[PDB]
Every structure is written in structure tokens, then in C-alpha cells.
Amino acid sequence: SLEARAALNQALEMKRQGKREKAQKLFMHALKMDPDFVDALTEFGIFSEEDKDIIQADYLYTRALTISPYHEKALVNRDRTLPLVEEIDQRYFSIIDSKVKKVMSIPKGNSALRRVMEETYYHHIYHTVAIEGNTLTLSEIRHILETRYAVPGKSDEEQNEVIGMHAAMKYINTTLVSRIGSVTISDVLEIHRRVLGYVDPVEAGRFRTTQVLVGHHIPPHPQDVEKQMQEFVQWLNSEEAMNLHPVEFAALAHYKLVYIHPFIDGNGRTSRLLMNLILMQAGYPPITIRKEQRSDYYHVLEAANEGDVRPFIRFIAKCTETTLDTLLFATTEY
Ligand SMILES: Nc1ncnc2c1ncn2[C@@H]1O[C@H](COP(=O)(O)OP(=O)(O)NP(=O)(O)O)[C@@H](O)[C@H]1O
Numbered sequence: 001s002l003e004a005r006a007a008l009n010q011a012l013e014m015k016r017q018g019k020r021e022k023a024q025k026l027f028m029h030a031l032k033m034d035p036d037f038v039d040a041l042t043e044f045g046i047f048s049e050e051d052k053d054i055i056q057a058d059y060l061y062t063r064a065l066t067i068s069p070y071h072e073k074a075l076v077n078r079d080r081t082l083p084l085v086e087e088i089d090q091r092y093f094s095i096i097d098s099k100v101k102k103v104m105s106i107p108k109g110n111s112a113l114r115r116v117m118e119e120t121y122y123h124h125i126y127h128t129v130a131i132e133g134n135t136l137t138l139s140e141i142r143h144i145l146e147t148r149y150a151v152p153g154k155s156d157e158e159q160n161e162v163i164g165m166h167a168a169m170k171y172i173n174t175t176l177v178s179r180i181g182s183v184t185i186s187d188v189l190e191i192h193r194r195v196l197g198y199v200d201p202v203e204a205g206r207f208r209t210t211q212v213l214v215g216h217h218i219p220p221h222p223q224d225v226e227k228q229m230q231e232f233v234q235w236l237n238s239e240e241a242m243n244l245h246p247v248e249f250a251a252l253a254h255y256k257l258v259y260i261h262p263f264i265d266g267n268g269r270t271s272r273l274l275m276n277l278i279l280m281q282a283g284y285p286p287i288t289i290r291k292e293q294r295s296d297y298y299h300v301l302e303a304a305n306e307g308d309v310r311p312f313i314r315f316i317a318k319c320t321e322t323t324l325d326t327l328l329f330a331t332t333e334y
């Protein structure tokens, strides 16, 4: 209905100008011209809730959600599955909480833990670069970082990706983990400057200025990157975010940054480092997304882009448990 679209637009204009009696009559007119106008049902719901008309607001929201019989069934069935899913997901977080407390309880000086923390550190760099096509072996990465002599017939780009990750991880561990106060945009830029500096020092620590494609994802226009990065770091330091479970917080931080895709390259590596900063600041160890999980990783990011972030949170939860199980399993040393 062309009149319904016009009635709604004019209703939102009258609401903005504070004339709510004229807004109400236009909302009613929009629904008279198109009773199934989702946009007008939802907006008239928001308008109703502002006036503390909770029953009317709920009626309009529920109407918007149940236009056709298949929507009706979807809402009935979802209301049944949700509590069962909330309970399954919460159980999994409590299993992770239990294994974190077991790893944390282990005394820092322990011979077994310290050997394993070193071995996994190189494992973690291997996975974070190998997942984007880096063909370096675990032994080659140990050589590059322990000796600081290059490896034969393997591109300097691949080797400088490793050096950058090492530099970025050391920077986080020394400067950011223990530091008190807010996470700034400059903290993210400082991580990116080290992650990408040794491969592309012109672009390292700098937001992109061009339109890009990330697989199936359309990140914001470069003109909007800075605005969304300001809203992002506001959320990072928000009271809401500090009340989230660390794994959820770390997972959402990771997803939100790769969604914005603010750099021309190293967005994944930076997001995974920011993820591990948040976990370490909450007393969890750094976790790995293995090379083998690339397909699953991309699938849950695509699902997040299309309006459900829970599969991504579960995937990060899964990855966290695998890491904790690896630390705990290495009591074989002791
Ligand atoms: N559909 C998607 N939506 C959002 N982010 C995505 C999507 N697909 C992939 N990504 C992320 O974008 C990264 C690739 O962007 P890029 O700037 O090249 O980062 P990178 O650090 O070079 N790559 P990587 O090591 O694989 O994370 C992927 O690794 C994911 O973290």
C-alpha cells in the first residue's frame, strides 16, 4: 500500500516533532490501509511502549511476528525450544567455568604448565596464520621466533606475518592485559600496527578508505568505519558488556570487529587477539581457532551476519573448552 508507506513515514515525522496525537492517527491509518504492514506494527509498538501501554505494544509486536500461519507455528515452536536452548547453552558455560577454575588453581611455577604454555604459544601463532593460507610449519615458526634467522625458500610475507603476531601478542601480554581503565580505538590500532606492520607498514595501524568484499559479508562504507569503531569501543567499555560471561563478551567483541572490517587486511588476526585480551583480562587462558575449523568458523560468521550470533558464541565456547582440555590433559607431564 503506497498510502500505508506514506502514513508511516508521516507518523515517524510527527513523533520526531513531538506531536504524538497526530502520530497515533497516522499509525492507525497505516494499519487501516495495510493491516499486515510489519514496519508500521513494530513502530506503533515502540510508540505504544513509550506511553507505557504494554498490552497494546505486545499485541502489535506479536502481530508483526505472526503475519502468516507458518509464522504463528514458528513463534509457538520457538517459545518451546528457547528455554531448552538457554539451559543447554548455560550448562556449557558452567562446564567451561569449572575447567577455567581447575587451570587457574594450578600453581604458576608448576613445571608441567610452563612447558605446555610455551608449546601452545607457538601452536596458537601457527593456527592464527595457517587459517588464512600461511604455509609455514610449527617447527619453521619456532625457528623464526627463537633464532630470528629466516627459513629457506618460504616467502618473507608469510614469515613477517609470524613476526607480527609474536610482536602483537607480546604487546598485549606486557602492556594491555594488566593495564587498568578503558580499551581505546588506539589500543586496537596499536595491536593492528604490530600484526600487519612487518608485511604492510603503510596500512598497519590505519583504517581502510576503500569499499571491500569479505566472503559473503558487505562491511560498512569506509566513510562510516570510524563512526562504527567509536560505537564498538563504547560497547566494549559499557556496563552491559562487563556483565556478559567472558566467553560471550570475547565472542561478540571478535564478531563485531570483523563485521566492521575496519582495516584492509589483518582484521581476523586483530579480532582474535582482541578476543584473547578480553579472556586473559577475565583470567581465562588464550584460546585457539584451529586451521581445520576454517569452514565451521566462516559458516557461524555468515549465520551472525544474517541475524543469529549464538552459533558464533557456541563455536567460540567450543574452541575455549578444547584449549582448557589441552592445558588440563597435559598433567601427563606431572
Ligand atoms: N562472512 C563474514 N563476515 C564477517 N567476517 C568474516 C566473514 N568471513 C570471514 N570473516 C573474517 O574476516 C577475516 C578475513 O579478513 P582479513 O582482513 O583478511 O583478516 P586476516 O587476519 O588477514 N585473515 P584470518 O587470519 O583468516 O583471520 C576472516 O579470517 C574472518 O575472521
Ligand SMILES: [Mg+2]
Pocket: 132, 265, 266, 267
Ligand atoms: Mg587477510
